[PDB]
Design a protein around this ligand. Structure first.
Ligand code: HEC
Ligand code: HEC
Lengths: 128, 128
């Protein structure tokens, strides 16, 4: 669906920026930079779960040229990248579910598992 | 949560782009420009309904200044802006519901209802 590679790059970048902003606000609440607010937290978790469904589509074959932080490795090992992306989506969905209840230990664990998705994928598939 | 006002503008622009990509795909399928897949159409409608809740947060005071197509009018008439935005969130949700059926007439009308809200807002609050 992308007319040029730049548009696929822009799409996936835009989605991850949105993900980072919303995910970071949950982080702030759990790290103690701001008080935990259950209502805002659940909006952020819902946002991350919905946004997680977006960027995969932008990783079109060979779009490692130009203004992208995606590595060529993505398309060398695309099944592994896809496995990570699916796990991330599933993690984000579990965080959204956890945010609908009061149990803080369950939220905190769900958040950690989702955060590990980010780091694990970036380590292998994103420029430093 | 924006570190600088440019960030708020980039956030809302990024969201609108994602909305446009998904809504545009849906309209291509309704207008004969690419093959129709009801499952894809539905999940795009769910993307739009989730995304529709994202850009409002970026419309912070003073962010008519910067690299933006938002008009100063937004902040004079923010009640009206917010009424249009919530109505958009509502109509995007309604399109997502319609997309769970095979009632093509109802889907076409839901899609038009959502399109009208894009235009209605842009006509008042976005630069030409
Ligand atoms: C692979 C399965 C990934 C997962 C899971 C997550 N990210 Fe990521 N992200 C990935 C790549 C390959 C890229 C580069 C995209 C490009 O074309 O440049 C990114 C990029 C980001 C960015 C920067 C976006 C931008 O403005 O250019 C951010 C802020 C980011 N990613 C954050 C992020 C977070 C917080 C995640 C977990 C909640 C996360 N990503 C997961 C690959 C993958
Ligand atoms: C007001 C309540 C709006 C509704 C409803 C919709 N949009 Fe809009 N949009 C609006 C403004 C004020 C702006 C300018 C943002 C800025 O800071 O420049 C926009 C912008 C867009 C864009 C351009 C994004 C970019 O890359 O800069 C697109 C593609 C866009 N809007 C599309 C869009 C669609 C398809 C909508 C309905 C499904 C829709 N918007 C609704 C205000 C509002």
């Amino acid at each position: 669906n992308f007319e040029e590679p730049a548009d696929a790059i822009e799409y996936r970048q835009a989605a991850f920026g949105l993900i980072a902003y919303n995910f970071g606000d949950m982080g702030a609440m759990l790290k103690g930079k701001k008080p935990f607010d259950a209502a805002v937290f659940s909006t952020r978790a819902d946002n991350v779960a919905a946004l997680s469904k977006i960027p995969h589509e932008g990783f079109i074959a060979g779009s490692d040229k130009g203004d992208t932080e995606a590595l060529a490795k993505i398309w060398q090992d695309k099944a592994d990248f896809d496995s990570k992306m699916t796990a991330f989506q599933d993690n984000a969905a579990a965080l959204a579910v956890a945010a609908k209840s009061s149990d803080q230990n369950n939220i905190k664990q769900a958040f950690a598992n989702t955060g590990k998705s980010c780091k694990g994928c970036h380590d292998v598939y994103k420029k430093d």
